[PDB]
């Protein structure tokens, strides 16, 4: 009545010279349903392999963002902060010749480090940005993320977008638009709103001056007015102001 493991057939063949060969072949195990052994610890448990990075291009590069955004509570402040810092580290570590033989596949197993690593990193960055931008930068309706860390994350994202891969191989299975720099107009607007919400955002210090220069560059590149980085009272009474005028007026 209890399940019995199938036996292995033992066959002894005597060679003409006299060399006996003994074989243990599971012919019965080759057929019939595979006997399932239920684990002692309740249900059968198996190891997952959704975190290992492999050379296959059919999937995305497994990053800690993937395991953080696997269905957790997105309203948790420390979880949001950890996701933001992991994304920042990913962008920081993120910041090629056409070979015929690799057209109908990916780069070979030996040349993974020299050709496919950057492509996988850029694809992972884009795919994680498309899911994280609305969490790191909440839409304009207290905040979960501070203006400084939001600015740092946006700067790293801009650096990744500017240093994205430019050469498009015929082996690139995705759309060619994914190899182009990102559009972060909404993110820059959100950062500007969060920076104007709190006062004393800009300081005459060297680090704050660098941050102001980075914000100006972001505004110029992403077509976002620089007036949104300052309170409207300083801009009230004027029909329209330009980014250059704002910089020359608020330069410390």
């Amino acid at each position: 009545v209890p399940r019995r493991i199938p036996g292995t057939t033992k066959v002894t063949y005597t060679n003409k010279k006299g060399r006996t060969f003994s074989f243990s072949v599971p012919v019965s195990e080759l057929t019939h349903p595979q006997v399932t052994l239920e684990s002692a610890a309740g249900t059968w448990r198996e190891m997952d392999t959704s975190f290992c990075e492999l050379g296959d291009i059919e999937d995305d590069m497994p990053s800690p963002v993937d395991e953080c955004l696997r269905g957790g509570s997105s309203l948790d402040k420390r979880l949001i902060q950890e996701v933001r810092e992991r994304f920042v580290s990913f962008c920081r570590e993120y910041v090629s010749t056409i070979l015929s033989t690799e057209l109908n596949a990916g780069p070979d197993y030996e040349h993974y480090d020299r050709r496919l690593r950057r492509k996988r990193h850029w694809l992972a960055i884009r795919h994680r940005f498309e899911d994280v931008r609305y969490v790191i930068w909440p839409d304009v309706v207290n905040p979960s993320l501070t203006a400084g860390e939001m600015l740092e994350a946006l700067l790293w994202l801009d650096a990744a977008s500017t240093f994205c891969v430019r050469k498009v191989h015929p082996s690139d299975l995705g759309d060619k638009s994914e190899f182009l720099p990102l559009d972060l107009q909404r993110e820059v607007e959100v950062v500007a709103c969060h920076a104007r919400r709190d006062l004393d955002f800009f300081d005459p210090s060297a680090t704050s001056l660098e941050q102001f220069t980075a914000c100006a560059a972001l505004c110029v590149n992403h077509r976002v007015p620089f007036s949104l980085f300052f309170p409207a009272q300083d801009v009230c009474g004027d029909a329209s102001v330009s980014t250059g005028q704002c910089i020359v007026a608020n330069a410390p």
Binding site: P2, R3, G18, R19, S24, E38, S39, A40
Partner: protein
């Protein structure tokens, strides 16, 4: 305050005390022991220790009740002095593996190591507050305390080994029938949350196996309790020990059937599976070495190149075993047998039911020998007037006049083993109990000590209780031991009491102390 512990039976090796004979003090004692052995029975203890053959020649009619009755206590002998050795004792393994030979050799090793310590370090046994040992460790500890002279101790251990061999011979099943296995419920995962419940469940398992197989000649029972929750040594026939191994297997506990029901039907399904496998032809000794080295020089079928060269087994000489050698891990034709070591069911090289119901006749025959061997009551009372000696029975100090000690010893004597089953056919006597009552009548402590030194041949040794008594009430903080291989230090160190105890080996770790 430290403790002195002697080793168990298993830790016997070839060439144990050879390096310690350089000291003249050790050499004189060793020569005395050799001369006593030659005068009494004429066996070569030095030869046995130095090299371990597969067969030895001993004096004629040395193994008989006539000798055990004539010799008594330190016989003058000399009648059989140059008589030729016309009888032999053989063993498939080394001849040292025989109990009647390893016990005298191991006691001699203990004595020579003690003399070596006493000479090199000025070691003092009286420094240790409590001294204890295993079945033969107790005889060795008595000799160390000075109750028994070394020659009489050698004679007594030889006598008890011969009686154990006689009991095995009287048992209908051959030497291969008796098997000894240590069980680990903690690794076997029998409700790991409560180790005490795990131990109780293992006891229930062995009780149920014995009850279910009482209709046949098979029997299993526990022998010693070494670790509180990790080691419990049992003995029995292969037919029942395979069922015990099946029971102590999470894969069999779950995949075969149940995994949620009571444990009573586990014994029934295990014995049914064992009967099915023995009908299917599964070998009863699968754990008998992987394979020997294969070298051939026929060249008729192997070729000239392969001759006189060892056949490499695996691409890396078996550094990573293949599926054929991992039967214990993945259940295969030999792995599915119950008698397969799986890190909780550890076989032991000994194939004798040391402490079981089979040896009650051995205890009865052995009692008079100890009775005559024990020294004068004046010396015994000099030892016992107010290092205390710890007994295997009852796991407590040996107080001759303790009212609770008399009750505890009687309880131990009348207490059957956990796996022991008795019926009308089984042979048992009250001779040991009445001898202990005669001693309790306070006629002399000689009778009491001779009954307590003979009642542990069959009764199980409560080593866990021995350790608890040594540590808790006696306040022993350092528990070192004198052993050739240092196996009992592991038992001391593995148990958790939290209090801390440090274990050392006197011969091996003399440098540390």
């Amino acid at each position: 305050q430290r403790a002195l512990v002697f080793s168990g039976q298993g830790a016997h090796r070839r060439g144990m005390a050879t390096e310690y004979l350089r000291i003249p003090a050790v050499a004189c004692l060793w020569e005395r022991m050799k001369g006593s052995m030659e005068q009494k029975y004429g066996i070569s203890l030095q030869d046995i220790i130095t090299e371990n053959p597969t067969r030895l020649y001993v004096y004629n009619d040395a193994y008989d009740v006539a000798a055990i009755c004539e010799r008594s206590c330190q016989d003058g002998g000399s009648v059989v002095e140059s008589t030729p050795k016309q009888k032999l004792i053989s063993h498939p393994q080394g001849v040292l593996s025989l109990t009647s030979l390893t016990q005298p050799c191991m006691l001699a090793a203990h004595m020579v190591s003690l003399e070596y310590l006493k000479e090199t370090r000025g070691y003092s046994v009286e420094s240790s507050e409590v001294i204890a040992g295993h079945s033969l460790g107790e005889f060795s500890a008595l000799c160390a305390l000075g109750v028994l002279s070394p020659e009489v101790a050698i004679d007594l251990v030889y006598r008890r080994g011969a009686l154990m061999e006689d009991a095995v011979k009287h048992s209908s099943q051959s030497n291969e029938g008796h098997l000894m296995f240590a069980c680990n419920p903690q690794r076997a995962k029998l409700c790991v949350e409560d180790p005490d419940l795990a131990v109780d469940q293992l006891h229930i398992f062995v009780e149920l196996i014995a009850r279910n197989l009482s209709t046949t000649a098979s029997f299993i029972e526990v022998v010693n309790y070494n670790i509180s929750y990790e080691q419990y040594v049992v003995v029995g026939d292969p037919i029942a020990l395979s069922a015990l191994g099946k029971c102590l297997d999470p894969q069999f506990r779950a995949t075969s059937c149940g995994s949620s029901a009571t444990l009573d039907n586990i014994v029934r399904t295990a014995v049914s599976s064992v009967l099915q496998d023995k009908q299917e032809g599964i070998t009863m000794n699968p754990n008998t070495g992987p394979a020997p080295d294969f070298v051939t020089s026929c060249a008729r079928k192997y070729g000239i190149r392969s001759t006189f060269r060892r056949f490499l087994r695996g691409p890396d000489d078996g550094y990573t075993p293949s599926l054929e050698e991992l039967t214990h891990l993945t259940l295969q034709e030999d792995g599915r047998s119950g008698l397969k070591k799986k890190s909780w069911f550890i076989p032991l090289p000994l194939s004798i039911p040391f402490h079981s119901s089979m040896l009650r006749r051995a205890m009865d025959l052995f009692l008079p020998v100890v009775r005559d061997a024990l020294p004068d009551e004046e010396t015994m009372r000099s030892f016992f007037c107010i290092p205390v000696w710890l007994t295997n029975l009852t796991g407590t100090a040996f107080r001759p006049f303790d009212v609770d000690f008399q009750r505890d010893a009687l309880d131990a004597m009348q207490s059957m083993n956990v796996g022991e089953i008795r019926h009308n056919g089984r042979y048992h006597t009250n001779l040991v109990e009445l001898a202990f009552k005669n001693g309790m009548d306070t006629s002399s402590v000689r009778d009491m000590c001779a009954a307590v030194l003979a009642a542990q041949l069959a009764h199980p040794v409560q080593w866990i209780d021995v350790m608890d008594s040594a540590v808790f009430q006696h306040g022993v903080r350092e528990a070192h031991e004198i052993s050739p291989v240092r196996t009992v230090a592991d038992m001391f160190k593995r148990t958790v009491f939290a209090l801390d105890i440090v274990t050392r080996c006197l011969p091996s770790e003399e440098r540390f102390l």
